[PDB]
Design an enzyme around this catalytic site. Structure first.
Site, PDB file in Angstrom:
ATOM      1  N   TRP A 221      38.315  26.654  34.740  1.00 47.77           N
ATOM      2  CA  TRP A 221      38.936  27.534  34.131  1.00 47.77           C
ATOM      3  C   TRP A 221      40.407  26.628  36.063  1.00 47.77           C
ATOM      4  O   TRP A 221      39.899  26.632  36.690  1.00 47.77           O
ATOM      5  CB  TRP A 221      38.496  29.129  34.093  1.00 47.77           C
ATOM      6  CG  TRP A 221      39.709  29.873  34.587  1.00 47.77           C
ATOM      7  CD1 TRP A 221      40.522  29.701  33.433  1.00 47.77           C
ATOM      8  CD2 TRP A 221      39.910  30.813  36.121  1.00 47.77           C
ATOM      9  NE1 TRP A 221      41.428  31.645  33.702  1.00 47.77           N
ATOM     10  CE2 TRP A 221      40.668  32.036  35.314  1.00 47.77           C
ATOM     11  CE3 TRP A 221      39.531  31.205  36.806  1.00 47.77           C
ATOM     12  CZ2 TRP A 221      41.068  33.024  35.615  1.00 47.77           C
ATOM     13  CZ3 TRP A 221      40.171  31.828  37.708  1.00 47.77           C
ATOM     14  CH2 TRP A 221      41.286  33.257  36.618  1.00 47.77           C
TER      15      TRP A 221
ATOM     16  N   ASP B  21      31.402  33.896  38.925  1.00 50.97           N
ATOM     17  CA  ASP B  21      32.914  34.495  37.852  1.00 50.97           C
ATOM     18  C   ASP B  21      32.280  35.482  36.672  1.00 50.97           C
ATOM     19  O   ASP B  21      32.336  34.614  35.746  1.00 50.97           O
ATOM     20  CB  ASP B  21      33.817  33.925  37.919  1.00 50.97           C
ATOM     21  CG  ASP B  21      35.286  34.447  37.618  1.00 50.97           C
ATOM     22  OD1 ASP B  21      35.531  34.965  36.792  1.00 50.97           O
ATOM     23  OD2 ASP B  21      36.086  33.438  37.887  1.00 50.97           O
TER      24      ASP B  21
ATOM     25  N   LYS C  14      39.554  42.999  31.003  1.00 45.70           N
ATOM     26  CA  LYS C  14      39.357  42.802  30.496  1.00 45.70           C
ATOM     27  C   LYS C  14      38.676  44.037  29.676  1.00 45.70           C
ATOM     28  O   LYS C  14      38.797  44.247  28.562  1.00 45.70           O
ATOM     29  CB  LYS C  14      38.696  41.327  29.594  1.00 45.70           C
ATOM     30  CG  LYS C  14      40.268  40.187  30.027  1.00 45.70           C
ATOM     31  CD  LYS C  14      39.541  38.866  31.373  1.00 45.70           C
ATOM     32  CE  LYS C  14      40.636  37.887  31.750  1.00 45.70           C
ATOM     33  NZ  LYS C  14      39.809  36.631  32.241  1.00 45.70           N
TER      34      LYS C  14
HETATM   35  O1  LIG Z   1      43.694  33.657  30.086  1.00 45.41           O
HETATM   36  C1  LIG Z   1      42.808  33.377  30.673  1.00 45.41           C
HETATM   37  O2  LIG Z   1      42.018  32.570  31.099  1.00 45.41           O
HETATM   38  C2  LIG Z   1      42.319  35.077  31.426  1.00 45.41           C
HETATM   39  C3  LIG Z   1      43.839  35.586  32.049  1.00 45.41           C
HETATM   40  C4  LIG Z   1      44.017  35.039  33.184  1.00 45.41           C
HETATM   41  C5  LIG Z   1      44.489  33.777  33.711  1.00 45.41           C
HETATM   42  C6  LIG Z   1      45.025  33.405  34.720  1.00 45.41           C
HETATM   43  C7  LIG Z   1      45.067  34.299  36.159  1.00 45.41           C
HETATM   44  C8  LIG Z   1      44.357  35.449  35.981  1.00 45.41           C
HETATM   45  C9  LIG Z   1      43.628  35.651  34.757  1.00 45.41           C
END
Ligand SMILES: O=C(O)CCc1ccccc1
Ligand SMILES: O=C(O)CCc1ccccc1
EC number: 2.6.1.1
Lengths: 396, 396
Positions: free
Chosen positions: B130, B211, B246
């Site tokens: 991520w 996380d 979420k």
């Molecule tokens: O789309 C995501 O990966 C989750 C939403 C998000 C994206 C970037 C920073 C915080 C949360």
């Protein structure tokens, strides 16, 4: 990994909350952290705020992430408050605003942005200073130096010493000013002095950073912004970290703004993209509820009217407490004349109490102030005034 | 000062929001940023949330600053969710929780705390990762290195490669795991694999950082926390950055937590005092509204029941869309078998689309995904499924 970590020193201001909570004695008086109390000795939610919250409850249909810089209407309303409707800064699109978690969040964002994207190594703050400035700027790897500000013998802005100490500031240093209600002294530049400082700042090449947490608490919304506007008229670049904590009574919702100003639209947009990056690397995007309340109030004529009156009422109650404080000290037999306190702007009185007098006030009397001698006048009421003044007289 | 600042590169995920907003074409399909959409293609506020917000409107009497670590009940409810009611970590007072502005805020707080107070120089993240992990940890001055994780040929966790790549991790390095619903692969360790990793981690001296943004989206609240609990049973120390964005649909209110665990109460309290210092130097104290909603729901039996059912309903709708997606691709004549997508946990499908296929999807078809090939299945509906699958088939 954590075995050898040393405990963090208590914060001179924030550490008061814990101490007060642990004090089981009744009739203690909280004059520490700067919150507005009403005559009942409580910290109310503003009526305009409750009305806005009801509207949000009825009308919000999503909690979809805000943009990194927050609610667009919030930014627009912010720039109007800061610079004035029809300001050239707004017309020329020279300013960009990120909604932040408090003015505190805005100070960190400004510091991170400056550290990573410019040659800034040093920030100048007044003596005496608000402790969080040093903490936040040091955290970002920036040196903090003090400039002379307050003449404690005359209880005045020592303008000569101010100007002379700032001679040590190099071009490209940041100089931090409080927009109004200097914390902790309550002493602000006059308009002429602001104008003089604005000219000096341009000549010397300082980047002005305004901490503007008290708009409306000195004289009024528009008047309180005169100094900042004097600077904005003279400078290509500056930053404002502003707050709605106090003027909306929205402390715990973390509602503030970092506003970046550059010479033109092209420059500010480019620079602001890196300010957004500094946010992305921190908390990603700002909390909606508090800022939505502010935008809702500021963008609705009826709510705005109610809110502005509430703000006036707060300022006026503090002014009444200021006078009653001075009067009650004198009638309780204080060994100092405290009339200088009437001249001070905002929530506080910078009382001249020593650190030991403050400690004794807390230990013996359950009266809580900051060790600097800063006392929250907005925490005084008709009902607690006699006891608190008896306590002060006893320690002098 | 700002003349020479270079524009910041667009964020691979966050930059999608702007692009989508600038796209004036109707019938575009947003499968980018990971938000939960309902069958109507909107991102609703949960009913339990609206109920909690009404209670707060009716019952809050102050916006007085929260403690640096936030609402005490919020922390307690958080630790129960993470570790289980009656966990030894809770009984032994080995954990301290700071309420933060999102899991994103918690990741920054953890990084700042580690950088300033320990010998940590390196954090290990999965490949693929991520993107915000690298950004945030780098921002705090920490190196980020990748460990092998996903076998793209088998669409499986390449456990052998994982373990072998982590041999390069030194004692005192941090290793970041996703608690469940690995973003972006949707592939999680089995319980046995978690247990194996927990043992390896202890042997090798890694500091685990979890996380945990998707608790409840893989199998359920308690099951999703098995991996974290396996680690907690084995380790003296770890950190959890968790999120309610979420699982409560509270994205824009910034509701998360940084939970610090040490060997004993004395150590965790001492270490946590420096974690609070890292917050003080950032945004000072966290935003109340979103966290108050979470605490209100989690601490009321009736609201909690409604909320947990809403969370189940979200998970189940995504599972239906997952199957329909795979079925519709096959009936639209896809040139790949996509049955591997059923095995993936959470909101996303890590589809194997190339960066150019993703770009073409957006340009030609108005279908928005992440360049990594990550598609938000929670953004699919019965009504948009046919068009989005026709688009994917066209670019294969
Ligand atoms: O789309 C995501 O990966 C989750 C939403 C998000 C994206 C970037 C920073 C915080 C949360
Ligand atoms: O008491 C003050 O100086 C103002 C309230 C405050 C204190 C510390 C951080 C943010 C706000």
């Amino acid at each position: 990994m954590f075995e050898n970590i040393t405990a963090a020193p208590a914060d001179p201001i924030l550490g008061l909350a814990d101490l007060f909570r642990a004090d089981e004695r009744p009739g203690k008086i909280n004059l520490g952290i700067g919150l507005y109390y009403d005559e009942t000795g409580k910290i109310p939610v503003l009526t305009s705020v409750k009305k806005a919250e009801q509207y949000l409850l009825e009308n919000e249909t999503t909690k979809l992430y805000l943009g990194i810089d927050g609610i667009p209407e919030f930014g627009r309303c912010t720039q109007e408050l800061l610079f004035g409707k029809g300001s050239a800064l707004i017309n020329d699109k020279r300013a960009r605003t990120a909604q932040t978690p408090g003015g505190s969040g805005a100070l960190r964002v400004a510091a991170d942005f400056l550290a990573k994207n410019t040659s800034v190594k040093r920030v100048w703050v007044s003596n005496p200073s608000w402790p969080n400035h040093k903490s936040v700027f040091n955290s970002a790897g920036l040196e903090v130096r003090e400039y002379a500000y307050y003449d404690a013998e005359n209880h005045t802005l020592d303008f000569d010493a101010l100007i002379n100490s700032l001679n040590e500031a190099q071009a490209g240093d940041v100089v931090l000013f409080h927009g109004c209600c200097h914390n902790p002294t309550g002493i602000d530049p006059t308009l002429e002095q602001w104008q003089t400082l604005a000219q000096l700042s341009v000549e010397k090449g300082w980047l002005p950073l305004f901490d503007f947490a008290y708009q409306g608490f000195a004289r009024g919304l528009e008047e309180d912004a005169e100094g900042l506007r004097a600077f904005a008229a003279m400078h290509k670049e500056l930053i404002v970290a502003s707050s709605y904590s106090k003027n909306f009574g929205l402390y715990n919702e973390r509602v503030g703004a970092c506003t970046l100003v550059a010479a033109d639209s092209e420059t500010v947009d480019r620079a602001f993209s890196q300010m957004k990056a500094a946010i992305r690397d921190n908390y990603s995007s700002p909390p909606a509820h508090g800022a939505s309340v502010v935008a809702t109030i500021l963008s609705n004529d009826a709510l705005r009217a109610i809110w502005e009156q509430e703000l006036t009422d707060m300022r006026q109650r503090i002014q009444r407490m200021r006078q009653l404080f001075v009067n009650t000290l004198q009638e309780k037999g204080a060994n100092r004349d405290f009339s200088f306190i009437i001249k001070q702007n905002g929530m506080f009185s910078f009382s001249g109490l020593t650190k030991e007098q403050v400690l004794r006030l807390r230990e013996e009397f359950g009266v809580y102030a900051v060790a600097s001698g800063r006392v929250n006048v907005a925490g005084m009421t008709p009902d607690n005034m006699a006891p608190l003044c008896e306590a002060i007289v006893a320690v002098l």
